[PDB]
Amino acid sequence: ENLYFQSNALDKINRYAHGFVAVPVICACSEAGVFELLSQKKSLKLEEIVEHLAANSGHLMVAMRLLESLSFLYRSQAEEYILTEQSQQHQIIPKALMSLYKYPFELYLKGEVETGISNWINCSSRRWDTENSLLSDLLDGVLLIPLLLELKKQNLLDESKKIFNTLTNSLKQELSTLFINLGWAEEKTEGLYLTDIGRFMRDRSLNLGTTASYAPMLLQMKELLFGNPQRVFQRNVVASGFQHEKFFADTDKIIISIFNQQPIEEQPIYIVDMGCGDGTLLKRIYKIIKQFSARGKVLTEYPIIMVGVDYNQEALDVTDKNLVDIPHLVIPGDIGAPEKLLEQLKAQGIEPEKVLHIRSFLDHDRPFIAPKNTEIAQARSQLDYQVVDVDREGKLIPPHIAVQSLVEHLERWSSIITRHGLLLLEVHSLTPAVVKKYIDESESLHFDAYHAFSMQHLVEADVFLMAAAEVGLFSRKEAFRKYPKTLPLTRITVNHFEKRKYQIRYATVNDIPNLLKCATFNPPVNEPFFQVLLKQTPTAHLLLEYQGELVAAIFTETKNSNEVLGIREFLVRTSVENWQVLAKDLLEFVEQWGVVKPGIKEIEGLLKYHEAISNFQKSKWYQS
Numbered sequence: 001e002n003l004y005f006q007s008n009a010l011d012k013i014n015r016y017a018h019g020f021v022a023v024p025v026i027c028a029c030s031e032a033g034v035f036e037l038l039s040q041k042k043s044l045k046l047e048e049i050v051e052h053l054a055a056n057s058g059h060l061m062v063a064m065r066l067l068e069s070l071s072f073l074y075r076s077q078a079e080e081y082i083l084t085e086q087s088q089q090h091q092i093i094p095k096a097l098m099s100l101y102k103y104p105f106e107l108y109l110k111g112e113v114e115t116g117i118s119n120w121i122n123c124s125s126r127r128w129d130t131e132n133s134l135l136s137d138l139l140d141g142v143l144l145i146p147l148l149l150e151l152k153k154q155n156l157l158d159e160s161k162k163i164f165n166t167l168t169n170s171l172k173q174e175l176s177t178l179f180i181n182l183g184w185a186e187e188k189t190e191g192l193y194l195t196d197i198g199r200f201m202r203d204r205s206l207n208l209g210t211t212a213s214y215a216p217m218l219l220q221m222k223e224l225l226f227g228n229p230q231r232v233f234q235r236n237v238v239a240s241g242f243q244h245e246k247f248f249a250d251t252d253k254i255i256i257s258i259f260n261q262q263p264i265e266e267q268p269i270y271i272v273d274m275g276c277g278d279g280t281l282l283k284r285i286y287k288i289i290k291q292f293s294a295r296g297k298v299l300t301e302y303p304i305i306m307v308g309v310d311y312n313q314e315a316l317d318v319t320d321k322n323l324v325d326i327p328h329l330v331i332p333g334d335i336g337a338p339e340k341l342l343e344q345l346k347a348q349g350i351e352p353e354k355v356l357h358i359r360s361f362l363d364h365d366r367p368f369i370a371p372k373n374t375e376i377a378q379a380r381s382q383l384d385y386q387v388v389d390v391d392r393e394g395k396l397i398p399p400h401i402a403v404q405s406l407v408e409h410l411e412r413w414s415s416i417i418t419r420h421g422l423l424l425l426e427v428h429s430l431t432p433a434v435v436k437k438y439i440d441e442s443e444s445l446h447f448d449a450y451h452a453f454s455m456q457h458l459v460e461a462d463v464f465l466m467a468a469a470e471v472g473l474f475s476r477k478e479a480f481r482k483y484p485k486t487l488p489l490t491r492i493t494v495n496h497f498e499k500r501k502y503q504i505r506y507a508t509v510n511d512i513p514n515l516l517k518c519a520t521f522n523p524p525v526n527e528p529f530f531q532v533l534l535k536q537t538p539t540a541h542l543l544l545e546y547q548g549e550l551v552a553a554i555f556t557e558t559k560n561s562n563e564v565l566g567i568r569e570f571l572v573r574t575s576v577e578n579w580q581v582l583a584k585d586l587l588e589f590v591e592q593w594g595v596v597k598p599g600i601k602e603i604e605g606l607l608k609y610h611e612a613i614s615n616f617q618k619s620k621w622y623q624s
């Protein structure tokens, strides 16, 4: 899809979805006095703004991260929010624009309400009286998402006969002016027709329905930020509405490769899908195995049994019927109760050693279970995670608590995973620093806000991989993929996790005594330098740990305005058996971790230190 359609169509729709979420957040903060407060106090931490405004810290934090990403707020290193030169743009947003989130567009297009949208069309033609091109697009999105969705639902952009000509003259004049102003239609000599851009708005699948369904919650943004969120939440795969489904083609390829492994008898027998839904992913994998893999030539001799697992009983039945001509079973289960799933499998003679676990876009939707390792959870408060996670009351869950929860969740899975591993797709959030640079290219701004508001559990891609590594789960380099492919940001990982005998975790001050005993490729580093290095970037330095032994550590730094990740130390404990393979594993992980680290465009040092350990032959290493 070419460059002209990228910037004049795709980017436009993405900005409209941005505005659809961002304009309600800005208005609710604007009306509550957030920018007035920050204009009086110069700078405030989240908990201070919460106190002054009696806010819900969780949802307000979502809002703060959105405002920072749009440059409406600056956030200092001490984590105080500060006004910016763009803050004052909140005054450009007409207060009454929020009424569109309850405007019956369906009745408007049928001529059944006299109150129309005529001044919002004129606002749009005046580009909302601002010179900020992006703001004009955020504001258009409030009108255009619901209107275009409704236009398409009533087939009013169909181009046989003419466009709009079945409407009343005033309705057809309003909409012709809007579509001409937008560049979506032009008056040719015989009539009015769509342009290439308007035809793109009509024909391409743009997730309009998904974005428009954010509306009932966005209507209640004031209640969510400053009132009672339990009033807001009163009374078959949404996440796979991205801009493509390349990741299922990747899953296809990974699957084929698993079931091309030789000899056949070492392949899995059961494919257990957590969150089976309507059996779609299972049916798709079974047909792929049949038509394209070696195993598909011998399904009579070596059966494959598809297993759908889901916590909703109705989903089991739709799955059980949709897989009627496929050897399958249907079992109730919950992600986050994998030990119960294993007890269930074993109660039907399914040996765990014969199982390949799969799931798509589900760990972020698990029921949150609070950390049970109280001590380990506390020790994690020294790290510096940016995770935003909201609880039943609208309060902010402390980032180390949210990550500890994730780690204990992956530890439960880690203990039932077998030699066949765990095929796992997941969606990930971004940091405000990165969303800032890629507002047009990435959906993060509205998606991360909407899903955090919804009390779901997104983390940054590198946090997710580190949480898996802490529990012995490693995304096989042969299968790994990240999207988007060509931007220094990661919204989707495609993973084939395997269980390994070691763990990789972040190094801490407590690791210094064993760091001091390591051989090292650069001049050895003393206690105080380790103290500084670790306190200033507590999530920059990784170690590989095996049965308690420090085997290796790598120290990194992020430079070139946060685009280049560089390696600055490599420590090995050469007394440890197989340290050379283990050190090379740690290095391979650092490469994957760097590929998904938000903002990182390239990595420096991977050839240098792989060579040093590859041909270690020369103890030109300090301390043996």
Ligand SMILES: Nc1ncnc2c1ncn2[C@@H]1O[C@H](CSCC[C@H](N)C(=O)O)[C@@H](O)[C@H]1O
Pocket (backbone or CB within 6 Å): 236, 237, 238, 239, 240, 274, 275, 276, 277, 278, 309, 310, 311, 312, 315, 333, 334, 335, 360, 361, 362, 365, 366, 367
């Ligand atoms: N906690 C849970 N345990 C097991 N299955 C679950 C579950 N939560 C949702 N599901 C199932 O997972 C299926 C969809 S898989 C992913 C769907 C969606 N993108 C999401 O974020 O959840 C649904 O059919 C649903 O019934």
